[PDB]
Amino acid sequence: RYEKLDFLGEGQFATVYKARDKNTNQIVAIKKINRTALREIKLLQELSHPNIIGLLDAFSNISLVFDFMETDLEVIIKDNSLVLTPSHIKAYMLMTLQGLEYLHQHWILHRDLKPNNLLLDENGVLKLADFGLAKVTRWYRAPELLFGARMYGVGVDMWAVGCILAELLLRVPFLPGDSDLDQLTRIFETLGTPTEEQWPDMCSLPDYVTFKSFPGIPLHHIFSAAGDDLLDLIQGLFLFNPCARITATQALKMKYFSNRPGPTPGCQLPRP
Numbered sequence: 717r718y719e720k721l722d723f724l725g726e727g728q729f730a731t732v733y734k735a736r737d738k739n740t741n742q743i744v745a746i747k748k749i750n751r752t753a754l755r756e757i758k759l760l761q762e763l764s765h766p767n768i769i770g771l772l773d774a775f776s777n778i779s780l781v782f783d784f785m786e787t788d789l790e791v792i793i794k795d796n797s798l799v800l801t802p803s804h805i806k807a808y809m810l811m812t813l814q815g816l817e818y819l820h821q822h823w824i825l826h827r828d829l830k831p832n833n834l835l836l837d838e839n840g841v842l843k844l845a846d847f848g849l850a851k852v853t854r855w856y857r858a859p860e861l862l863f864g865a866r867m868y869g870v871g872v873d874m875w876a877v878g879c880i881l882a883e884l885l886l887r888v889p890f891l892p893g894d895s896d897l898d899q900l901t902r903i904f905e906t907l908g909t910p911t912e913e914q915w916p917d918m919c920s921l922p923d924y925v926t927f928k929s930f931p932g933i934p935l936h937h938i939f940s941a942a943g944d945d946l947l948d949l950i951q952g953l954f955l956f957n958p959c960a961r962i963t964a965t966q967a968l969k970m971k972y973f974s975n976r977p978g979p980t981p982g983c984q985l986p987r988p
């Protein structure tokens with residue numbers, strides 16, 4: 717029922733192809749990989765937010781149809797020819813946080829936030845992807861997960877948002893750990909080792925271990941081109957206590973989003 721146009725990329729997780737719609741000639745992408753599946757599929761079809769990937773139709777052979785996107789935030793970040801102005805970063809952050817807020821309001825965690833999961837269309841609209849039921853990521857992993865927490869919440873997605881913000885500002889991954897232990901070392905060397913005051917109940921985590929006491933590097937020295945409003949946003953996203961860490965609604969109300977300059981409109985966002 718769909719007209720296969722091109723080959724975008726393949727993997728054991730999903731087989732992605734570029735295709736055209738046979739009802740309204742709209743270019744869409746298809747991910748080819750049941751009563752229990754329909755329960756999750758109809759819930760995903762019921763979701764509707766401009767900054768969240770839309771599930772238009774499905775196919776028995778597990779085939780899912782979503783809107784077509786040009787690139788993701790990873791392609792943009794790696795493009796040396798592209799220049800990310802403060803207004804460009806603010807636009808990507810506003811869209812990411814607006815999409816995350818919708819998911820959290822509907823009790824859905826992304827669980828895998830990273831640049832290649834924030835996709836962009838021809839009109840400069842960011843949409844989150846890869847969050848519906850499981851049928852490199854260590855760099856964006858929150859410290860509670862690295863200490864083996866089995867029960868977790870919104871802080872897991874919020875920490876990853878801070879890592880994406882830091883990657884837009886530095887143009888390289890913020891904390892590129894070589895292992896789960898090195899990831900915790902990089903977090904503590906950079907942000908400081910948390911105390912029982914900063915993170916109460918840290919010692920009760922399943923894989924809790926005592927690290928060397930690091931003072932940390934002041935956020936203003938790390939992000940030398942950031943203003944005080946942006947430094948406050950970064951500080952809230954990287955609080956050690958998962959309960960104290962800023963939520964998507966709290967982040968959207970920060971003075972950063974209401975201050976000048978404003979976000980770059982979609983049509984003016986850089987395209988590769």
Ligand SMILES: CC(C)c1cnn2c(NCc3ccccc3-n3cccn3)nc(O[C@@H]3CCCNC3)nc12
Pocket residue numbers: 723724725726732745746747769782783784785786787788791835845846
């Ligand atoms: C998430 C859904 C299934 C979707 C929608 N659109 N879409 C594209 N669009 C093309 C694209 C996006 C991001 C980066 C590169 C491309 N691209 C490939 C060729 C030309 N542009 N690629 C992939 O998935 C692909 C293949 C699997 C890895 N991610 C990109 N998945 C999709």
